[PDB]
């Protein structure tokens, strides 16, 4: 059968390792399985709300890039909320139409009353897209900067 205790030795006689027993044929082993010894040996071995309420009118954003050396400026209107716009780097493998030859990355900045503005980065790593590291959001002038 499929039980690991039943096996075939080099001699070819059947043998139950669970009971340490030898049987001449299959019927003797099956009669041993119904016996007290095999049952006792087996008994011994037995032991969402914020995403749906977000308004999307998709206004026209104003991004200004500048090649620095040692940084993009996004002009956004007044949102009147404490939620800062967040930037994140994603891949071009997921799209609404999935165009061919998409093997680059895109850093996109998104806010709640405005639409996300995305910029493609052909380079591998030239900066850091972390939010708390190299980003700033002045709510007095409503200016977003990321370097």
């Amino acid at each position: 059968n499929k039980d690991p205790y039943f096996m075939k030795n080099h001699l070819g006689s059947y043998e139950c390792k669970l009971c340490l027993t030898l049987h001449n044929n299959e019927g003797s082993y099956l009669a041993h399985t119904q016996g007290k010894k095999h049952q006792t040996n087996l008994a011994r071995r037995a032991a969402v709300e914020v995403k749906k309420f977000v308004k999307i009118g998709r206004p026209g954003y104003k991004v200004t890039k500048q090649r620095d050396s040692e940084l993009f400026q996004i002009d956004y209107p007044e949102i009147a909320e404490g939620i800062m716009p967040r930037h994140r780097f994603m891949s071009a493998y997921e799209q609404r139409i999935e165009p061919p030859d998409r093997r680059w990355q895109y850093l996109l900045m998104a806010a709640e009353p405005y639409e996300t503005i995305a910029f493609k980065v052909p380079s591998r790593e030239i900066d850091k897209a972390e939010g708390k590291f190299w980003t700033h959001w002045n709510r007095e002038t409503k200016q977003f900067f990321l370097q």
Binding site: G60, M90, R96, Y106, E115, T116, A118
Partner: protein, 123 residues
């Protein structure tokens, strides 16, 4: 670590009596073949040496005990109790500000994990 702490205390005591920022008793000792690795800001002991120099500068204040005598902290337990209550109120305000900053960070993390990342627009 007692000898290094004593050397740092001696450097903080000798640097606090200087009349300028670079004209001290430790800048000329660096050119006098005396090895002092605690003067450079790259070491971790420099942050403790700066605090020791700040304490030595605050021990030279005119109400620190050089030409005046403190009467409110030395002869008024009610003023010390009011200062302890003000410090406890400042600690409670700092804890409330930290809780508000943690709540704002949690709100920003909830807003960032619910926005649509598939609406890409390249202008």
């Amino acid at each position: 670590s007692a000898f290094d702490l004593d050397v740092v205390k001696l450097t903080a005591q000798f640097v606090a009596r200087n009349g300028r920022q670079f004209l001290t008793q430790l800048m000329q000792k660096e050119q006098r073949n005396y090895q002092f690795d605690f003067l450079r800001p790259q070491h971790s002991l420099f942050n403790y040496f700066t605090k020791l120099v700040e304490q030595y500068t605050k021990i030279l204040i005119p109400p620190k005990g050089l030409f005046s005598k403190l009467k409110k902290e030395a002869e008024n337990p009610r003023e010390v109790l009011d200062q302890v209550c003000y410090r406890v109120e400042w600690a409670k305000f700092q804890e409330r500000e930290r809780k508000k900053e943690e709540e704002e960070k949690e709100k920003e993390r909830v807003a960032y994990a619910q926005i649509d990342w598939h609406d890409f627009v390249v202008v």
